[PDB]
From a paper:
Anion exchanger 3 (AE3) is pivotal in regulating intracellular pH across excitable tissues, yet its structural intricacies and functional dynamics remain underexplored compared to other anion exchangers. This study unveils the structural insights into human AE3, including the cryo-electron microscopy structures for AE3 transmembrane domains (TMD) and a chimera combining AE3 N-terminal domain (NTD) with AE2 TMD ([name]).
To overcome this obstacle and gain structural insight into the AE3 NTD, we constructed a chimeric anion exchanger, combining the NTD of hAE3 (297–671) with the TMD of hAE2 (672–1241). The cryo-EM structure of [name] was determined at an overall resolution of 3.35 Å, with both AE3 NTD and AE2 TMD clearly resolved in the EM map. Dimerization of the AE3 NTDs is primarily facilitated by interactions among the loops linking NH7/8 (loopNH7/8) and NH1/β strand c (loopNH1/c), as well as helix NH8 from both protomers. In the [name] structure, the AE3 NTD engages with the AE2 TMD in a manner reminiscent of AE2’s own NTD-TMD interactions, with the loopTMH10/11 extending from the TMD into the NTD surface. In our structure of the NTDAE3-TMDAE2 chimera, densities of PIP2, cholesterol, and CHS in the TMD of AE2 correspond with the previous AE1 and AE2 models, further confirming the lipid regulation of human AE2.
Residue numbers in the entry:
A (entry chain A), B (entry chain B): 314 to 430, 497 to 648, 672 to 855, 894 to 1221
Amino acid sequence: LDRRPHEVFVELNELMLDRSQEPHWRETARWIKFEEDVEEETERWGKPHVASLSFRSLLELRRTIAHGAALLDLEQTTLPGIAHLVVETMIVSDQIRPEDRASVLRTLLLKHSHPNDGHRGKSLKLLEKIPEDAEATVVLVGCVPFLEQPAAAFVRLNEAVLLESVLEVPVPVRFLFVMLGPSHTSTDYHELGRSIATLMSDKLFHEAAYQADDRQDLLSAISEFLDGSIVIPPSEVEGRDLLRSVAAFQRELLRKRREREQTKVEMTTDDPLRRTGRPFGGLIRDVRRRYPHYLSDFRDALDPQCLAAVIFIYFAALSPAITFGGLLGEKTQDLIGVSELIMSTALQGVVFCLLGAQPLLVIGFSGPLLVFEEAFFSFCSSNHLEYLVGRVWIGFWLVFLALLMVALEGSFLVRFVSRFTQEIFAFLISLIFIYETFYKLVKIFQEHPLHGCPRGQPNTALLSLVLMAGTFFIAFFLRKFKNSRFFPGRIRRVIGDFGVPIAILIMVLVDYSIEDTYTQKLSVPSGFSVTAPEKRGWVINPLGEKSPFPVWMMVASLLPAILVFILIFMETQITTLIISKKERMLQKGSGFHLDLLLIVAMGGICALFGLPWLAAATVRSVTHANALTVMSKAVAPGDKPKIQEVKEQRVTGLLVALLVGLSIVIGDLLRQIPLAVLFGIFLYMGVTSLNGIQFYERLHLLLMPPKHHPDVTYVKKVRTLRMHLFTALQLLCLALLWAVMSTAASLAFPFILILTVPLRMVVLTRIFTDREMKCLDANEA
Amino acid sequence: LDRRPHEVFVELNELMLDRSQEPHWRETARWIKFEEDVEEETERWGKPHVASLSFRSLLELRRTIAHGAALLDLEQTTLPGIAHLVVETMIVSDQIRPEDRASVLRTLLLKHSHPNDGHRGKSLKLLEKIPEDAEATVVLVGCVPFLEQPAAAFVRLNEAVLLESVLEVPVPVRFLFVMLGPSHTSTDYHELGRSIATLMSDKLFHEAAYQADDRQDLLSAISEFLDGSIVIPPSEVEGRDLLRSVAAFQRELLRKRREREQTKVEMTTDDPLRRTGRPFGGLIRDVRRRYPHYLSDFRDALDPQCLAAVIFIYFAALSPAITFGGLLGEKTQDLIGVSELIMSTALQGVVFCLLGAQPLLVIGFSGPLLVFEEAFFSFCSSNHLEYLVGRVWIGFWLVFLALLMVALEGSFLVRFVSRFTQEIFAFLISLIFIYETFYKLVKIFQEHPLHGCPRGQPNTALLSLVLMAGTFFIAFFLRKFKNSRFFPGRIRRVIGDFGVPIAILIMVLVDYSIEDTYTQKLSVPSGFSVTAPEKRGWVINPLGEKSPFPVWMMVASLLPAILVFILIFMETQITTLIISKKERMLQKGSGFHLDLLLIVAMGGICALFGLPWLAAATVRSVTHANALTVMSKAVAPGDKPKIQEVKEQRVTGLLVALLVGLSIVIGDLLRQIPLAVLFGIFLYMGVTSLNGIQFYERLHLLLMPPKHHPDVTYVKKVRTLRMHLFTALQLLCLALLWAVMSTAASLAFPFILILTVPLRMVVLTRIFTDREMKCLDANEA
Ligand SMILES: CCCCC/C=C/C/C=C\C/C=C\C/C=C/CCCC(=O)O[C@H](COC(=O)CCCCCCCCCCCCCCCCC)COP(=O)(O)O[C@@H]1[C@H](O)[C@H](O)[C@@H](OP(=O)(O)O)[C@H](OP(=O)(O)O)[C@H]1O
Ligand SMILES: CCCCC/C=C\C/C=C\C/C=C/C/C=C/CCCC(=O)O[C@H](COC(=O)CCCCCCCCCCCCCCCCC)COP(=O)(O)O[C@@H]1[C@H](O)[C@H](O)[C@@H](OP(=O)(O)O)[C@H](OP(=O)(O)O)[C@H]1O
Ligand SMILES: CC(C)CCC[C@@H](C)[C@H]1CC[C@H]2[C@@H]3CC=C4C[C@@H](OC(=O)CCC(=O)O)CC[C@]4(C)[C@H]3CC[C@]12C
Ligand SMILES: CC(C)CCC[C@@H](C)[C@H]1CC[C@H]2[C@@H]3CC=C4C[C@@H](OC(=O)CCC(=O)O)CC[C@]4(C)[C@H]3CC[C@]12C
Ligand SMILES: CC(C)CCC[C@@H](C)[C@H]1CC[C@H]2[C@@H]3CC=C4C[C@@H](O)CC[C@]4(C)[C@H]3CC[C@]12C
Ligand SMILES: CC(C)CCC[C@@H](C)[C@H]1CC[C@H]2[C@@H]3CC=C4C[C@@H](O)CC[C@]4(C)[C@H]3CC[C@]12C
């Protein structure tokens, strides 16, 4: 006929006596894709587990179903009618004596019980998990003194009917299994109930039962279910490694089974990085996919979910801004400071969030840019060249290069930048955070020596070290608290997401308590003014501030433009690639050509006002994306979490940028933060961003004996001595890059990264196997 | 007949082609109580795992063995003869055409291969694991193109014979299984080989095959094996909680099976704490069990294993001695100091290790004794009583109470001291380590305030804190390194066992480097002299040093004697109970009556010379025992470690005591250790000993949601509220005890600690059920 299959919610009800000896059915276990048992002593629900059967119970079940009486497509609609029909058929099939007809019927008309039978508070919580269109089944297994032989009955109702006071949740029933036998047999009826329920909770078996017509089809379905099972021999499980191989073996077995099924069935039977050719094609394609959703981009942020992010993202886009800028003040003779960096961050962020194609990106100063800033400053103050005027021409060339790269569709080279260079560029970012911290500490200890009885203050070095260590430890332990197993589980996440503000506030109050001790503090000027209003204006003359600019450097400034373009391009395209994956349920569209052009043009224009260039960070962009995802609730117990949807809007980023811009009118309060707390946070970010990259783990695996290596796909398919050779080559390249960065040619490491782009292909294909590269240099997993 | 069963070492050899296309057998997996597989791509052995089967392969195996030809008790002794007989029987049973008799015969005399076929270095390393009296079996499965139907043969040799160049290790073979079939069938021969090998490596199946005589018994044994198995349904393993329930279910299933077997079999069929009554009976009983082994006790320590302990146990019995000895000097006006404590430790340790019944005990000053010392000092300097004379009479009463308690057999009350009071006592010991550290820190910060520009030194208050934190962190992280997964695994343990010496040495060097900063240092006097040689002699006059002693106190000193006897008795008896368990394979014997009498008598006599009393520590004794256990090497791969034996001797303890005694002639070197380094170790010992006691874990569970609780036996059998009530009732008693310890009646907390023994027997039984007490207050597990 039609018999459209539905998902099944299976319940086990067992007959038992009460304290007043009145017999009644009590619920014992429930199946929603996984078994859940009721503990007898404490009367609560245990954790979900895989439903492991036993073989003797399966044999007994097959024998019982072979000798039982089955009713198919019954026309009854009430419990008494179903019970009467069942007892009549049991009488017909010579299973129960007619004299007991009056007795056994009374056993099928008893009240049902449940652990929770206040009720709605858990009834709704269980109804959320169950799929919307699910049809339930009831298994009634128990022993009766007045019977002599076991009797079984399988009933499939013609139409779903809601039997009240039978199940645990209001779901219609479709199937009924009744078993009633004597108590002197060797069979365990709880085991038979568990076996039949685990059979019915399966996918293929329950579909077959939906489409079945007699007992032979039930036997065939039982054989089909048994074909793809795993038998575990009777041996003690001593260690823990013994049961880590079941998943892979089950995967292979079910793969073979599904391949056989697919063969039998066969016998029975918009890339965003593709270049078209039209000039500026990518720009038009990206605009005409994202702009029409403009109204929805604003209407979609009216919920508290989109208000709790702005509170702490503001604290993540601000801490580096006041840190990095300070460093520039120490490195460029206070030509570029915290005020200019904050103004540039705000001004570029608001425009990008109003006109960008991917509003979920937050842009700001990053690690590998201040190194280039310092290198260019060192080069400028060697040949008697003004530092701040050359940046104007660098930006002028950068704006032209961006247009050249966008006009001819060329933002597809990010496909050639594989994991080999991404993991090196992650170590560079995570090592210009630790080095600056451990250099500032040494400088502090040198300026204020530790002799006995401004410069030479008594208790300044050790106090700064203590503040740094305290801030780092607080920020680390709150991060570890975020993913722990304490507290109600939603306050846990909220507290764990405020690690940085809490750490900074605590370690600022501690230093505010201490009096009569000098600790260096932030330098934020009053009002809207340039950090050095004695040698620098707001607009830079493109011809020369103090002396006329040379004409040769006007054209010879092509090389630094190319290097900084390489840096910006890598840092932005990698982030856009990471954000717009398929695992993250990002609807609408992503912009690969409207982000590069906008960022580089804004940087080039902004460098005229003596403000730094910016590039989208790849760590706080992921944090911004994560803070906006909402997970589903219709997930079966014990199943892995599933992302429902990500709220895409351009209102949280705009508000965060505006807040960071307005954070300059509270300078009187921002001048009370000591300069060691910020470096504690600096070191914390540097250390904590290492987790995730495979280069770090393969570097760990150097010190581990080959017996203790994990079972990941890049360690169990390649020999140990080739994994170590790959790691050694990567380390050698990283060390060479650091050496060339630390010498007098510091403004050449972008060229070294571009030269490690094709080393991979040419050399590491001429050496390694075509099969080992897919294991070690894989882009997925 | 006889057919005595042995353990079985199963190997799987599969036919395959070489690069030169020459056919040969290659080893694929091996079974010693657990499966171990050879990876095809990398050619190395994977980790052990439980041998999970598949059902279709089992059905194919049953059908193949049903139609195969079996040879029982063959008289051949060489491979060619066995092959000839096998081919003849295959021809007899109409399985192989006679025309192919030659061809298949060749396939039975091909060279065998192995992963390691340098060979001896791993041959011995694997021969260690295999049991000495084990007999092996060889499984040969592969495909051939010249056959049309599968043929099988099972051969059991009459006597074990060493077949060279067949197995991987030189072990005699007893069984042979040969299977050869066409390559166009749907059967997978690797799976059949795995199935038959996992059958033959079982504990009951191989015995059944030993006693078997025909094919029907093989089928019966197959059914027996299948009876006690677990079937896992075809569902994906999504999470990780799914497979944590297999162990318990397997335990229950095997328990039922073994109960059935035992029922069928039935149908077919020196306490050391027992009082006798004779006076001093226990003393004689433990003397006559331990003294005769004197020569063995002295002859059993001639190995490097008994020499690496003395190196670091000396560093564990010394750090508290110079710490506690300092504190008493600050608390008793330098009447008892480091020198007196060190000398008492040495003098009592040597005598105890020379005459004791349990030499594996290290005695020394512990936490709850200095609290009583301080309380008695505070009581003495209130009524104008000399402090050092009263201890003489306290010892005089103690040496009488010990004799009274030993003469009438009374060292059996330790059975009534349950876990309820043991955990409270462990918290008391672990909370007098943190408190003293965090009080010394506050005192240091108060004496040297943090103002700007002996008392009032500039950089002392922060330097001491830095040193404490550094020492604690180093000592903690080396402890965590001891049980990590780095380094060759035997250097790892050696480095992890030297945490305290390394942590102290590094920071001593660091503070040595710093110049022109004052940090308070240890006060160890030169030569053999008392700590204060201006107000105290070496022999205390029992009548009064400065003024005559009152006569009323001479008799009234009974109460402190009891209040300190309780502490000594608990601390010694708990340690002796913990040490002499059954899990620790301690041979010879333990003395419950020769340790109490000796320790208390030595404490009473040693208090006449103005030296403190001592009681065995329950943490350093366990460390001493652990440092002397030697583990076995004959353990199958993947199995849990097993203790071979423990070297019991009275030479390492005597040497450690002598070293601690001689550590006073290096005072010029011990006076360079800053006093803030030792308190790091103090706090580390306080924090690190909380792990293990169930009170701490049940205190953690107050914050966990009921969803995240573990699966231990005391959380899944009692309701959550009736667990938190028990935890709160324990915390209330602990808080009351800590309150009575801090007021002006501080020398009464032993009475409170002994008043919680009848509380458990009277009150906590009238509230909690008889079944909840066995779950929460269990002595085992
Ligand atoms: C500014 C700093 C302030 C610090 C001052 C102190 C601050 C407090 C400091 C230290 C002590 C703190 C916390 C101790 C904790 C109690 C909660 C821990 C036990 C607990 O968890 O109980 C809770 C709540 O039940 C109560 O009513 C519990 C009733 C709590 C009693 C009231 C406590 C309120 C605070 C007491 C002190 C009040 C002090 C206020 C005075 C102010 C002084 C200034 C039961 O939770 P549940 O089982 O019903 O819900 C579960 C649970 O949330 C799971 O975690 C969750 O799974 P995950 O999301 O994966 O984690 C489940 O979700 P699914 O099943 O769908 O997957 C939920 O279904
Ligand atoms: C700089 C970074 C700072 C932070 C980094 C962290 C720390 C500071 C950094 C670096 C310092 C250290 C390097 C030390 C490490 C090497 C990695 C160890 C890998 C390794 O394990 O390889 C070893 C030996 O292989 C060699 O022959 C290896 C032979 C060549 C090794 C080098 C030779 C000289 C080493 C010293 C170098 C000298 C350097 C200084 C001297 C220069 C002076 C100017 C293979 O060991 P195995 O597989 O044969 O034996 C296993 C293994 O021991 C398992 O652990 C054990 O199981 P468990 O007991 O349960 O753990 C098995 O027992 P069962 O079968 O009964 O279960 C054994 O069967
Ligand atoms: C920068 C260093 C100090 C850090 C890490 C060094 C090791 C992880 C590397 C350095 C040299 C490497 C070896 C150098 C070359 C080879 C050849 C390599 O090629 C082969 O397969 C040998 C046979 C052939 O050439 O085909 C096998 C691994 C091995 C021994 C390497 C193993 C790993 C080693 C010891
Ligand atoms: C300040 C902190 C560190 C101390 C610990 C406090 C809580 C862990 C304790 C204090 C009071 C306890 C409650 C006191 C009384 C009861 C009644 C008790 O009632 C029953 O035993 C049920 C049977 C019946 O109702 O007769 C169940 C536990 C409960 C809720 C206890 C739960 C745990 C509480 C809240
Ligand atoms: C400290 C680190 C970063 C650099 C020093 C690396 C040297 C000292 C260590 C690190 C990794 C080590 C290797 C780790 C694993 C093996 C496999 C083993 O079967 C032979 C030795 C061998 C090949 C080790 C040789 C020594 C080795 C190369
Ligand atoms: C500082 C800490 C140790 C003190 C916190 C103690 C109080 C607030 C905590 C300790 C244990 C907690 C209990 C833990 C588990 C449950 C089970 C839940 O179904 C109802 C609430 C209840 C009963 C909690 C109530 C709050 C509780 C009693």
